[PDB]
Amino acid sequence: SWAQSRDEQNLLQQKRIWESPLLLAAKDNDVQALNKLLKYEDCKVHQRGAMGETALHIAALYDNLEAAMVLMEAAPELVFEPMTSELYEGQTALHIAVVNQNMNLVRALLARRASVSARATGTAFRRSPCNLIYFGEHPLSFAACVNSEEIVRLLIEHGADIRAQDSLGNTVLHILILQPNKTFACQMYNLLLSYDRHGDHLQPLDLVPNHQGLTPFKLAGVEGNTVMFQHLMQKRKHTQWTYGPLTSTLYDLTEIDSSGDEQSLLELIITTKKREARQILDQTPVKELVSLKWKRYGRPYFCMLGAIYLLYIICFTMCCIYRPLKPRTNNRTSPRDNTLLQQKLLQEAYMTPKDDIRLVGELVTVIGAIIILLVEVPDIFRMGVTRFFGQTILGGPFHVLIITYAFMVLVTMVMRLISASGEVVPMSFALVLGWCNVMYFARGFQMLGPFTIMIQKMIFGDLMRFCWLMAVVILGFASAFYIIFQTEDPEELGHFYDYPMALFSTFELFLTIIDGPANYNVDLPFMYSITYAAFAIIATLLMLNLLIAMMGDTHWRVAHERDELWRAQIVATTVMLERKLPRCLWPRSGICGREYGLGDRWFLRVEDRQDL
Amino acid sequence: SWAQSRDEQNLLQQKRIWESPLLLAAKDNDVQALNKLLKYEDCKVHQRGAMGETALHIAALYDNLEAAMVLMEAAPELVFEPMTSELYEGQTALHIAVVNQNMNLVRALLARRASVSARATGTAFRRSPCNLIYFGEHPLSFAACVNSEEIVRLLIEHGADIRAQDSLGNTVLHILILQPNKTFACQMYNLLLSYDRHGDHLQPLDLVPNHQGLTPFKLAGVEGNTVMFQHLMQKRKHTQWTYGPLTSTLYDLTEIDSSGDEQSLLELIITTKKREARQILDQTPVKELVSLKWKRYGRPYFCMLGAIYLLYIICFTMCCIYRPLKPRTNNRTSPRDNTLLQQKLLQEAYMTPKDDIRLVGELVTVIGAIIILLVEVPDIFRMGVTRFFGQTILGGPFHVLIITYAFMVLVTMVMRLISASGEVVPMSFALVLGWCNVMYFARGFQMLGPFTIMIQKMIFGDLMRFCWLMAVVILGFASAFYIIFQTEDPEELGHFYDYPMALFSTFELFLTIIDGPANYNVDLPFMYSITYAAFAIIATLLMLNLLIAMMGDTHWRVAHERDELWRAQIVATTVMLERKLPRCLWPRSGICGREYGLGDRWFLRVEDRQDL
Numbered sequence A, B: 001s002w003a004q005s006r007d008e009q010n011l012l013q014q015k016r017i018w019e020s021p022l023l024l025a026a027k028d029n030d031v032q033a034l035n036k037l038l039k040y041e042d043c044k045v046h047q048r049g050a051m052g053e054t055a056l057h058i059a060a061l062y063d064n065l066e067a068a069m070v071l072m073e074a075a076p077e078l079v080f081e082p083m084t085s086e087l088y089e090g091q092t093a094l095h096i097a098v099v100n101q102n103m104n105l106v107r108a109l110l111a112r113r114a115s116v117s118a119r120a121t122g123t124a125f126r127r128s129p130c131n132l133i134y135f136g137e138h139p140l141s142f143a144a145c146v147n148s149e150e151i152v153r154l155l156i157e158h159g160a161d162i163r164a165q166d167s168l169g170n171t172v173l174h175i176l177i178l179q180p181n182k183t184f185a186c187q188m189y190n191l192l193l194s195y196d197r198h199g200d201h202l203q204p205l206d207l208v209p210n211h212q213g214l215t216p217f218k219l220a221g222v223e224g225n226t227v228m229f230q231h232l233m234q235k236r237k238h239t240q241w242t243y244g245p246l247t248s249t250l251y252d253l254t255e256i257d258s259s260g261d262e263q264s265l266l267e268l269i270i271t272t273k274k275r276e277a278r279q280i281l282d283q284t285p286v287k288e289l290v291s292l293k294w295k296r297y298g299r300p301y302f303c304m305l306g307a308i309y310l311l312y313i314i315c316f317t318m319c320c321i322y323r324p325l326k327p328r329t330n331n332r333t334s335p336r337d338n339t340l341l342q343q344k345l346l347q348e349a350y351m352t353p354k355d356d357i358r359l360v361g362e363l364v365t366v367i368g369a370i371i372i373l374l375v376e377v378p379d380i381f382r383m384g385v386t387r388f389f390g391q392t393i394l395g396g397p398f399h400v401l402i403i404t405y406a407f408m409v410l411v412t413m414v415m416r417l418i419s420a421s422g423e424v425v426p427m428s429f430a431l432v433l434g435w436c437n438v439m440y441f442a443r444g445f446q447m448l449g450p451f452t453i454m455i456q457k458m459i460f461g462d463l464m465r466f467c468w469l470m471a472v473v474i475l476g477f478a479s480a481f482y483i484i485f486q487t488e489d490p491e492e493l494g495h496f497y498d499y500p501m502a503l504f505s506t507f508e509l510f511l512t513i514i515d516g517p518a519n520y521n522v523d524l525p526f527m528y529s530i531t532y533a534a535f536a537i538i539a540t541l542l543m544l545n546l547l548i549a550m551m552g553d554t555h556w557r558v559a560h561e562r563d564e565l566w567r568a569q570i571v572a573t574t575v576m577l578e579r580k581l582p583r584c585l586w587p588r589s590g591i592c593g594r595e596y597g598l599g600d601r602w603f604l605r606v607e608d609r610q611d612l
Ligand SMILES: O=c1ccc(CN2CCN([C@H]3CC[C@@](O)(c4cccc(C(F)(F)F)c4)CC3)CC2)c[nH]1
Pocket: A397, A398, A401, A432, A433, A436, A437, A439, A452, A453, A454, A455, A456, A457, A459
């Protein structure tokens, strides 16, 4: 958060140029002074600017062709001297004129034995939202981003190497994927692949990995580059037989499927959270693969885990409602009419000839709680500890919720074995978080799927937009009613005797789920009737109806994210089950190879009407 | 509200022209009669019209070129005689033909030694919504508004002065800012500045103030002239270094910032209430200045005042709920079962070894109530007494609400020191208006900011559209139920015994926050069951559901004013805090001068991708 140090360096650049006389003469076409300043005075050859540059840079930066040519004749050594500051490090004079994208200077600058393999690092060239650009490092890539393809044929002639990575790791092909000018950068991608004379007996320049470990085809998948993803597909598929308006292709599918030992394409589209990245699930190779792996091979394995889970909690609620109880002995009721306990649960009463079935009842549900923690907790020691806060948009808060369920059921084993007294406090949390976690199996069924991803967008966002302003009005008005019934016997209107209940009975009246305090035999204090009518004119006629105004306004301008988030949620179920189920189940989708003269990669086909 | 006197004068103008024969001959091209009427008769040279005009005016008003030329030859003195009425005062014959915007008369009228410095005052030329025009006063400005630029080069040749103000104070440059024809009046603004040969060793004709104290650049800011605000910015900025698609400018910022001793641009955009004026907060110099002064330097100073205020009311509610009480002695209960008081608060009981902490409790909250009135009440003796009713749309009703809070807490000091009896009546107002005034700190946080400016648009407007028709149905039906339970013992159905409660129990049933009167052991009067079912068919199924129909219809057609009013509300917090905080805090945003050869004004920079 110190961009002011970057803002200081730019404004220091002018004042240094205003100081020296020939840098002003390099800023403009003051070529009359360039004949004088080098012939008459001395030693003004190697002084630097504010960010450590030469007069050759400044004439290159403000595209002054006439002044740059005289300075090269004066001392043909300034091309070898790069910039030296920490923002612009190593950036030579060739790099400046190529970004200006229309120069005949590069034919005159490379004529004086200029270098093409200069290392242009620095902090204004690495990928970050602080910069507005990402040009890579090499001048081959500098021409590749501004789309001056006349320069590229002239720069590749003098020894420019294609396969050149950088300090971040990506190649020249990867820079073309990451541009906002998507439309006619695709026409340049045909050129950079075409200047590949030999494959160097290794990977043929389209499969090179970076340090972050991606191919250029996969990198189109993560950043959501839709239009470039189509032209990359054109090398993979090949048509088989055309028959009038009916045609039939055969997609390659060696890289868009999870068959492997490491990352795939369907793994990374779910893992990223870019809004544009989840539109590749609508194009023709990916949609056919995910729907063939879900109408079969995925859905009866999803409802087999459906019915096993529903027969877990029903064998748990039946274990819950039969708690071992007795009458309340040896603790006879000391306060009068203010305690109403009469059970005081058992501790050593699993020796009874009915209770042997309930011993099975805990033994079933506590074996499953071991299996829950041994199927999710080993996914945050192999994976990072922030991925539970990382997949939270798509399929995330249920993985928080199932961990907390099994941690509560293990508490009630600890307390009952040690014979504790307070017992229903975790066991009531272990029965809401059970039955509200069968909510997770609503993403499978359509007509129940855009109604779970809607309420996830609503319990965050809009209701947290309201629960503050709900807990600001009621937190005050409860303190207004608790003053006003200090002068009142709680035998009538017992809604306010303790401030811990007055804060409750205001919240329970704010939603109109109590009637409202009225006795009608005795009178009321006079200030009550005014400040309660000011509550109703806020609570039931302004503040609560403004939910339905916001529920009805949100629910149609996320009605297109709704039906798309369900499609991305069906894939996070698809990739997760294939990774955890073994290999006898889930045969790999598609027809295999090494039988029909194709190779070892396994294919898929799709056919469609051309529509003429 | 007497436009009929203005309507009378226009219709009197025709009948006077119908009377005299040569004014009809001036109304048309009756030039045959003009050869006769001046040669044959006498003395018809100086008679006036209804609004005091000559025959030269009438031939100029209906653009009759032939009749105007003969009348100038007859007596070359009529050009010096202006109009003389109270509507059209001093308006000479040159002024009429210039408004018609296409005349060669002005070359023939200025040929006879016409004056250019005529003072055209009057009540139809000053800026008001009664007029439909605002032309200024000088004929240089008359040509400047109708955009006849061929006249302007011909009128400036004969001695027209540019720097000429009027009775309101504004200049010729200011008239071009206030036109509805915004698009190609900008192309005329280049001409009027270009005829400035010398700067007169003073301000160079672009910084002149009026009597209301504005520059032409600021006057574009107040009236919301968006397209003219762009071309005015073009003289202030100057580019620094262009680098491919990345460019980097340096805005001037000596006039769009509150650094001074008086008004600035950001002061006046909030103060005006013009709907178009709050769109200048989206253009590139103003948005970058307000967001840099809010991500830093403004937001932790806004939440430092956040947490200090929340630890004020919690140290006040804790002071509230511990009121000094006792049992109700010496006033034993005289009415039976109709009074239920048993406390009767203390008056001289701050001498007790627990109560010394609560003496700190009042002493904290009553020092702050002095500080509230000594930080807001001196903003309506220096400023006007109508600005609390003047900033009410943007950041206004909270400044009403914080004054009323501190005035109520000072009441409960007066009553407790004088040992009064009625005590909870202002102290309950001092606890709703406390906790509902921490609502004011919801404009700072996004996702809580379009939900406070929404409810301000709703407690006014739509709920005052409904609270009348709510208090017309219930005011009658309560009088219908209070008749019908005159014949009823209040021991059962005690919802109606006094008309002050029947008016309450109808309002509390109109929102369905009581059940509804039913006993079901004894019967009811028969007319009750009909006229109460006619209440429910209005109160819960027609009249109250029509809120949600209006809440759901308002909340999407102010959904663009919603997210814009929040941006203007963040600026009224920004300008206000910088004006009241001292100078060691809030350093002025941007890089300073007198170090880099620029001057003494302090600059800002911004850079953006050109997008080619
Ligand atoms: O004392 C209590 C009683 C009940 C609780 C229950 N929690 C835990 C779970 N959440 C509820 C709310 C709605 C629920 O469908 C849900 C949770 C998370 C995500 C979703 C989603 F919308 F994504 F499906 C739904 C379950 C129970 C919130 C309160 C806590 N503490």
